Amino acid sequence: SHPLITLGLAASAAGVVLLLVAGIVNALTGENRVHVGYAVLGGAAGFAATALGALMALGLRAISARTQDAMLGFAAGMMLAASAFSLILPGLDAAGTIVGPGPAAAAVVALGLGLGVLLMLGLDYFTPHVNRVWLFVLTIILHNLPEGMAIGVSFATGDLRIGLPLTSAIAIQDVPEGLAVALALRAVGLPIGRAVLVAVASGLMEPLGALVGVGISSGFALAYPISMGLAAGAMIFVVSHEVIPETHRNGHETTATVGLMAGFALMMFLDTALG
Amino acid sequence: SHPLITLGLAASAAGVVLLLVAGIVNALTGENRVHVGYAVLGGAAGFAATALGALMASARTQDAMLGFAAGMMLAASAFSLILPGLDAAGTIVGPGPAAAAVVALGLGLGVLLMLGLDYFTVNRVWLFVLTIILHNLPEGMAIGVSFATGDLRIGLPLTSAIAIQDVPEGLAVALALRPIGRAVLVAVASGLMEPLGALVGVGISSGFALAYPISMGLAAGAMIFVVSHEVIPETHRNGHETTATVGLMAGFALMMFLDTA
């Protein structure tokens, strides 16, 4: 019948629901702590940067494949580095305060990572790939939800040192993403204003994702490092499965790799400068 | 030709933009002490109510719920938004006609925003879908404004009224979007403008001391317009108003009873 991916999806969605309900219940039993505010601001920055990129498509009505390969390589490189330096490693530091240090902390983050990958892997396998247009639009609007989620997760401590570099890196990555989303939507056949409209709307999952992110991470002390892994795993999958294969659209692999390494090193700079 | 509605809409949208930017700037640069946790809890509740409605996919039982919500919404507009807005403005400029002016500005802007948003609701489906989803934005904003101070005594009554409103609206939005699958999906997505709107509602109400009573009037004026121009007259499309008339009476009376606990 079905692969174990279906069981992974079910257990990951159940885990997300359990984490999110634990968040709500705790938020219904605790008071006077800011940590929603920066997650909201960071998600709003994500929306605004995604809109800025999309609006550039109105004039730059198409770009060379070399530019696409460069742009999405840069986007991929930023988000792989951000998953490592701003999610996984601070998750291991956080889980090191509770059950670790040492591999007890790694088990908590690996539980996160597996849930994040199995969620996104399951969601992809339940796309059939009644039109490409509607399936692709649905895919696009949801695409930024793990980016919001990473924002809200990283800010769930209120810590500028963790959330600001990731949010800056996502915000910077959102401009290529929103532009490339808008131009892809045009190429599918939507009028450019309708394509740019949907691309702007895709940024609304970045605030909404940041609400989900601050939720799932708040219910209990280990829900934070679990959610750090979950956001990292969801991002890592989405980068490896959505973004990176679109960086080879006409074989400009050198251009794509220069973008990747530039984005990776830029994210390392952002964390070194803002952390 | 284009009446003063065009001016009033544009000036009120500029007011929303101004208020929101002031709230952002205060958040980024002030010792901001605004409450937003309850607002996103209330906005998520509004989404969930709108989703449940869409998953419900004669009209007289819906007219009963629409009348009941409308009653709850009018009472919450008066007792939860306008009067604590007047008390808030009475902490700064008033009491008396000075405090009344600050809330009346809010009420005007709120009314004018909705009066303009209604203006445009062939493939005109795109404009219908746009207006459909955005209709939940002011509902979100009112929730956010009601929770901006963290008073459960204010945020719970209004958010309940809007959540009860959201159940018939979810069904109505799905049904008015007409298989049902992508229509109910878009109805579920429409509910997501209430969490988003609740962030906007907290934002506009936060830049400066008077931004709270202005936004309380703005929330109240928008929701009163929604009731007076949409939710109530939607009944007379079906049968007669009577069942919603009893809904209006009962919902209004219940709300002020719960306020008198």
Curated annotation (Swiss-Prot), chain A:
Binding site for Cd(2+) 1: M79, H143, E147, Q173, E177
Keyword list, A-Z: Cadmium, Cell inner membrane, Cell membrane, Ion transport, Membrane, Transmembrane, Transmembrane helix, Transport, Zinc, Zinc transport
Residue numbers binding Zn(2+) 2: H143, E242
Positions on the Extracellular side per record topology: 31-35, 100-101, 157-158, 218-221, 275
Protein's job: Selective electrodiffusional channel that mediates the uptake of Zn(2+). Exploits in vivo zinc concentration gradients (maintained by cellular zinc homeostasis) to passively move zinc ions into the cytoplasm. ZIPB-mediated zinc flux is dependent upon pH, but independent of the proton motive force. Is also able to import Cd(2+), but is not permeable to Co(2+), Cu(2+), Fe(2+), Mn(2+) and Ni(2+).
Sequence similarity: Belongs to the ZIP transporter (TC 2.A.5) family.
Listed name of the protein: Zinc transporter ZIPB
Native species: Bordetella bronchiseptica (strain ATCC BAA-588 / NCTC 13252 / RB50)
From Swiss-Prot, chain B:
Annotated keywords: Cadmium, Cell inner membrane, Cell membrane, Ion transport, Membrane, Transmembrane, Transmembrane helix, Transport, Zinc, Zinc transport
Binding annotation for Zn(2+) 1: E139, Q165, E169
GO CC field: plasma membrane
Known partners and oligomeric status: Homodimer. Also exists as a monomer.
Anything else known: The zinc flux through ZIPB is extremely slow in comparison with typical ion channels and is nonsaturating with respect to a zinc concentration up to 2 mM.
Outcome when changing E194A: Loses metal binding at M2 but does not lead to significant changes in either overall structure or metal coordination at M1
Periplasmic domain ranges by topology: 230-241
Membrane-topology annotation of the record: Multi-pass membrane protein
Source taxon at top rank: Bacteria
Residues that coordinate or bind Cd(2+) 2: N136, E139, D166, E169, E194
Full protein name: Zinc transporter ZIPB
Family matches, as InterPro entries: ZIP (IPR003689)
Main location: membrane
Signal peptide: none
Effect of D166A: Loses metal binding at M2 but does not lead to significant changes in either overall structure or metal coordination at M1
Reactions catalysed according to its record: Zn(2+)(in) = Zn(2+)(out); Cd(2+)(in) = Cd(2+)(out)
Binding site for Zn(2+) 2: H135, E230
Binding site for Zn(2+) 4: D118
UniProt topological domain (Extracellular) ranges: 31-35, 94-95, 149-150, 206-209
Natural source organism: Bordetella bronchiseptica (strain ATCC BAA-588 / NCTC 13252 / RB50)
GO MF annotation: an example: zinc ion transmembrane transporter activity
